[PDB]
Design a protein around this ligand. Sequence first.
Ligand SMILES: CCCc1cc(C(=O)n2cc3cnn(CCO)c3c2)no1
Ligand SMILES: CCCc1cc(C(=O)n2cc3cnn(CCO)c3c2)no1
Lengths: 196, 196
Amino acid sequence: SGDDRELAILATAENLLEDRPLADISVDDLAKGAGISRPTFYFYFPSKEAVLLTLLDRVVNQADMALQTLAENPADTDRENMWRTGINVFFETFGSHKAVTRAGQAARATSVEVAELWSTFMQKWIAYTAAVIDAERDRGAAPRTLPAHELATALNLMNERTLFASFAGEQPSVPEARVLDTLVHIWVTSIYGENR
Amino acid sequence: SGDDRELAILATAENLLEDRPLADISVDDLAKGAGISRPTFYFYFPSKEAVLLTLLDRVVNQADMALQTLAENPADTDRENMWRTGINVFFETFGSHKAVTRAGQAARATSVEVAELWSTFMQKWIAYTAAVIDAERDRGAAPRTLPAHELATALNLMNERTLFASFAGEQPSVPEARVLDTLVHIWVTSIYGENR
Ligand SMILES: CCCc1cc(C(=O)n2cc3cnn(CCO)c3c2)no1
Ligand SMILES: CCCc1cc(C(=O)n2cc3cnn(CCO)c3c2)no1
């Protein structure tokens, strides 16, 4: 069937990207994994690059839907926990799909569609962050220091670079078992910290 | 002469990278700019990729030497200024060589030598940051909150990603005229901010 063969292709690709990068994975490898022929592959996708775009789109929307769920239901907690739970959506969602994350970031250089997808969602997440900061200031809990959108931008770019370094075991990187605490500290201190 | 023709090659390359990426720049373009023949080019460098490595090495060492100069002579100032002056070395050095910065970051994906160069200097800068944090804690000015090396790592990765986004005018990015204040705020609040 249609959905079924498409889903097999996507599953095969996610599995193979755990062992090697996209440039070392052939359309034949994808077709063989999904139990189809090569020209049947080309009915569902034009290129192996398109398969990666679809996988990345799935993961990014997963994160975005999780964040939306959280935005609807507040945990009954203190401000530090509020931010930890939110950053954790990204830590768990992308950390549960490390191969797709790593491949997707590398594709930003060579694929205008992948760059645009990542840009679009980063803008959305920055805007949301800035809206929460603005709410915290309006209720008197956070000081009016930097422009909230500029602060949100830098904190979100920190998380993009730091999470993906950690997941890839780059040198340098924060260890994966430390990265959530590290990021939460920097978000909380910079959002709530006053000018001396 | 030897140094002279090498320097012309490097100058030509830095000029051409302002207009286009390395993949659209030929060895003939480099040789023509430097007033030499193609095989004379190959006496001084093996590839256009090697030229970029040399340019990047120059810029990274420029920044590192500037930071060393600062580490020798303290400004007579408050703590926020101490960090601003130091972050400004990177803002001015890389911001004065935007084409080389942009090309060098893109080459990290395809060049093990470029990745290793950037890794080596990031480790050095992180270690230095962490040593200053540790000094600030030992004198009683900064609280003992996160592991200083993990904090330094995330702050330095923030700056890498945020500065290069700003210089490239990426969407999203902090405007270049705002990025120094934004980064300094987040470093100062996270280094000096207490646990509530
Ligand atoms: C590979 C992860 C890329 C990434 C992570 C993040 C991130 O950690 N966040 C996006 C956010 C939008 N809102 N929040 C916290 C809101 O409480 C967010 C954190 N932004 O980009
Ligand atoms: C394209 C710039 C990449 C970059 C910038 C930085 C950076 O902003 N810094 C490196 C640092 C080492 N020490 N400091 C501040 C010390 O007072 C530093 C800031 N690290 O990597």
